[PDB]
């Protein structure tokens, strides 16, 4: 099928590591992370991948020469040989080459800007059958070529580089224009109780394993958000059905939910999680009754009014609350007619926020233990975490004083919301721990970084 402008598809390279065998997608997490890397999206078994960061958005497959005049200052079909604008939807740090030493071929990296030659990539397919200036088909191989440094895109075998060597890169489908009232995977949304599904915000020795429906402001909390993954890699984002099987990645900690029939049902680390153990799926009502439907995924379940209950497959057990107010959420056939999951989509900003917060929690820690590691010998992700800091600083600032009051105030509401959101986990206190660990020194240990 044709791949048009304004569509979500990942770049799945056929990246066997010169032997065997993983079909890893291109990925770069976005905020605080200019540098490119690689993530699995094919090991759909005991070691589940990380799909959320791979989701590039198609943008502008304009002609090369056409780009030249736009430099001199909306569903156009994709065609071979055009420069293409691209995106990490999570960050909107558009995919791009950048000038760094990572052997003289500059590494690709995610600049925010829609400016410049950097964010464009002409295609030069090896198949003359598909000459440049031809409509892209689903899954097609291609070698991106920088418009900027004029390097070919490449997989340095792991290391990523824009070199004169030529890796192919498939456009694996995810979603094509989601409609409101029509639920999709790879796409966060709350699991309501009437009040909604969530887990403890302590993020402590209690590894958020506890699982509870809960009302009030917890519903705004990131902890009450869930990134569903349908048991498909292609068209993961295609519209969901009340039946088709699906993975349940957590958003705030990134953990896959899985079949721990102990504690009924509970969160588990994204390592035990299994494609089998996570095989949850929606149902219209408590009932025990083709696949995959690729190419768009038919519209069905509401972002709002409609109920769906999640029957499991590996155990077959229905999800339900077990009984301060902390009603649980556990797997067995009955429970009661009141799981009340009238699903509704998460806001854009909520999700980037959240996923970023998991990125941050996902980054400080090794930094912390690693700085603490030479505290044992008085006498190390430095610059990447500095990048994370200045990124959050950017992410968290006041509206322009030189602005209209309405946008100042709305933007201030965005600020207030975002601050509240990152405060929901209190990782700031982890920062407080950091500061506690640091300024012992007069200047010192390590004597280099």
């Amino acid at each position: 099928q044709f791949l048009r402008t304004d569509d979500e598809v990942v770049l799945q390279c056929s990246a066997t590591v010169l032997k065997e065998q993983l079909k890893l997608c291109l990925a770069a997490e976005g905020f605080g992370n200019r540098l490119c890397f690689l993530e699995p999206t094919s090991n759909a078994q005991n070691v589940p991948p990380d799909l959320a960061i791979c989701c590039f958005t198609l943008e502008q497959s304009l002609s090369v020469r056409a780009l030249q005049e736009m430099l001199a200052n909306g569903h156009r079909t994709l065609l071979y040989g055009h420069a293409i604008l691209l995106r990490h939807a999570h960050s909107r740090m558009y995919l791009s080459c950048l000038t760094t030493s990572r052997k003289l071929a500059f590494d690709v990296g995610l600049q925010e800007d829609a400016t410049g030659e950097a964010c464009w990539w002409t295609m030069h397919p090896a198949s003359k059958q598909r000459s440049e200036g031809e409509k892209v088909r689903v899954g097609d191989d291609l070698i991106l070529v920088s418009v900027s440094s004029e390097r070919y895109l490449h997989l340095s075998t792991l290391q990523v580089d824009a070199s004169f060597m030529q890796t192919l890169w498939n456009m694996n489908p995810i979603c094509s224009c989601c409609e409101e009232g029509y639920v999709t995977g790879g796409h966060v949304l709350r699991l309501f109780h009437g009040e909604c599904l969530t887990i403890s915000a302590a993020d402590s020795d209690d590894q958020r394993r506890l699982v509870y429906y809960e009302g009030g402001a917890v519903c705004t909390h990131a902890r009450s958000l869930w990134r569903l993954e349908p048991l498909r890699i292609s068209w993961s984002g295609s519209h969901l059905r009340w039946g088709q099987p699906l993975r349940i990645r957590h958003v705030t900690t990134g953990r896959y939910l899985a079949l721990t029939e102990d504690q009924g049902l509970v969160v588990v680390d994204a390592c035990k999680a299994h494609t089998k153990a996570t095989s949850f799926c929606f149902r219209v009502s408590k009932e025990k009754l083709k696949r995959d439907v690729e190419g768009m995924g038919p519209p069905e379940i509401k972002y709002g009014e409609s109920l769906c209950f999640v029957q499991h497959v590996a155990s077959g057990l229905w999800l339900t609350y077990a009984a301060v107010l902390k009603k649980k959420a556990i797997l067995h056939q009955e429970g009661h007619m009141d799981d009340a999951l009238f699903l509704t989509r998460c806001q854009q900003e909520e999700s980037q926020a959240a996923r970023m917060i998991h990125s941050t929690a996902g980054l400080y820690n090794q930094f912390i233990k690693g700085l603490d590691s030479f505290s044992g010998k008085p006498r190390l992700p430095i610059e990447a975490v500095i990048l994370s800091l200045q990124d959050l600083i950017g992410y968290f600032e006041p509206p322009s004083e030189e602005l209209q009051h309405e946008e100042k105030q709305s933007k201030l509401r965005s600020l207030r919301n975002r601050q509240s959101l990152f405060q929901e986990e209190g990782m700031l206190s982890l920062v407080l721990n950091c500061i506690d660990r640091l300024n012992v020194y007069t200047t010192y240990a390590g004597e280099e970084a």
């Binding site: 056409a66 030249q68 200036g133």
Partner: protein
């Protein structure tokens, strides 16, 4: 020579004038031969590439006006 192309495809037009659709289809599918070809697909393709010339002629000349 672009003039030759002009002349060539005018020639091809002359194959088809008087509207002999049997001949036009036969150009489309070449049934007498075991092989098959649709010429016209290809002239479309020529139109494509010449068009793409036109286009780059635009993206150059448009910035210079005159």
């Amino acid at each position: 020579d672009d003039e030759f192309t002009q002349d060539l495809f005018r020639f091809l037009q002359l194959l088809c004038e008087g509207h002999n659709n049997d001949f036009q289809n036969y150009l489309r599918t070449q049934t007498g031969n075991t092989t098959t070809i649709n010429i016209i697909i290809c002239t479309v393709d020529y139109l494509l590439r010449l068009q793409e010339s036109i286009s780059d002629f635009y993206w150059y000349y448009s910035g210079k006006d005159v």
